[PDB]
């Protein structure tokens, strides 16, 4: 790419997924660079210099170098959307899509990693009930979120969805989304897959990983 | 001002809120929710606030939640310089990931360990807990590297969210200042504000003093 935007990433993680579909629907080219996180390449001192947190996503953006996939999403809306729909300037409207991102990062994605890194860092294969009931305390609130709305900031696609989406096809790693339990989740998350650029993007990686993980367990709560 | 904040003061969130409303010098009533009575949970609470939480915001009819949306919202509704929260891009981009850092790593961490206590009276924290919150802390300390704040040279949003959170973590861990000597340095340096000490210390101290009566095993 000439644009000078480099992604540093994997795709079966669902935080760079965010910010690969952020890229798509702005239409900006990029490079991607894959980080080879089961050789410990976000631990070298070169990738640690740029992110003490040594975490997968991080943009370039020609020099500048941030992380998380939340502020990355919303960097790239504020500086090279055409319109703001995806991250409303409106105080009022922003604040709706910034809770959601702030839900997005401390209840969802903390209640999946709280079941994941113990995998990922101690070989952890038995999961105790108290983190399966953490992520359906996490589903139910989503549930009420998404009312009668088809997205999850209202009537139009957000970073919300973006940022939220791709944690929740993560879930089932764990825990099984019930549509007789979760309807409102399970059509969200249907509407989502009805984008083509959304389930190109989402799809394939979050089954290679729900897969994956769903090998691994020994047991699964009570 | 017409603005009302639903909070109350033993919840780090809630503080982080009041602080901001005072360095931008605005006044509102406090309207403080009774958590232990289950105000949160009433049918007129959860229509403004489906999630149920404290701190809410009502900005004049706009109802806002989750301290870090609200602390954003604030800064760039009623602030007559950007320095909390700036403008540029890219300096925005370092204090919205310390905010998402805050929400995602430390709150996550410390509400690990005191959720299971308010909904079911649990009172034996697993060691890995500990160490989760440990690992948060490691992060942080890297994080403040030899710059005073969070985000750099001046105070922003993300150290009036991360301080009051950091400030409950000491309620499961001790926060040893040969492991971490910058983040004692850091919370040291925001209590050398007197704002920040009037608000954030004394509500602090209980929580940590009630969480630390309960444990019948921390860890290993
Ligand atoms: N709040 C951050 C989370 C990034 C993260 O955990 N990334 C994982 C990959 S999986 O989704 C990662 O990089 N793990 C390596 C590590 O933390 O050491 C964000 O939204 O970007
Ligand atoms: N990410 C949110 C966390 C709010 C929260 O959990 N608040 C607690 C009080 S402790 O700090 C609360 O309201 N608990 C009641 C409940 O969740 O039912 C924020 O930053 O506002």
């Known amino acids: 790419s000439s644009s000078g935007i480099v992604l540093y990433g994997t795709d079966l993680s669902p935080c760079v997924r965010t910010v690969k579909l952020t890229l798509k629907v702005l239409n900006l080219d990029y490079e991607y660079k894959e980080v080879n996180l089961q050789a410990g390449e976000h631990l070298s001192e070169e990738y640690v210099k740029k992110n003490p947190q040594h975490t997968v996503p991080m943009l370039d953006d020609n020099g500048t170098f941030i992380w998380d996939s939340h502020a990355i999403a919303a960097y790239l809306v504020d500086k090279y959307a055409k319109s703001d729909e995806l991250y409303p300037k409106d105080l009022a409207k922003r604040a709706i899509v910034n809770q959601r991102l702030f839900f997005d990062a401390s209840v969802i994605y903390?209640?999946?990693?709280?079941?994941?890194?113990?995998?990922?860092?101690?070989?952890?294969?038995?999961?105790?009930?108290?983190?399966?009931?953490?992520?359906?305390?996490?589903?139910?609130?989503?549930?009420?979120?998404?009312?009668?709305?088809?997205?999850?900031?209202?009537?139009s696609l957000t970073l919300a969805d973006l940022s939220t989406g791709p944690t929740v096809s993560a879930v089932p790693a764990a825990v099984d989304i019930d549509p007789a339990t979760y309807p409102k989740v399970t059509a969200w998350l249907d509407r989502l897959n009805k984008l083509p650029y959304y389930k190109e993007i989402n799809e394939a990686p979050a089954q290679s990983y729900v897969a994956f993980l769903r090998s691994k367990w020994t047991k699964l709560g009570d």
């Open 110 to 155: 903390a209640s999946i990693a709280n079941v994941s890194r113990p995998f990922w860092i101690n070989g952890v294969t038995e999961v105790p009930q108290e983190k399966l009931d953490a992520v359906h305390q996490g589903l139910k609130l989503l549930e009420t979120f998404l009312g009668n709305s088809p997205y999850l900031a209202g009537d």
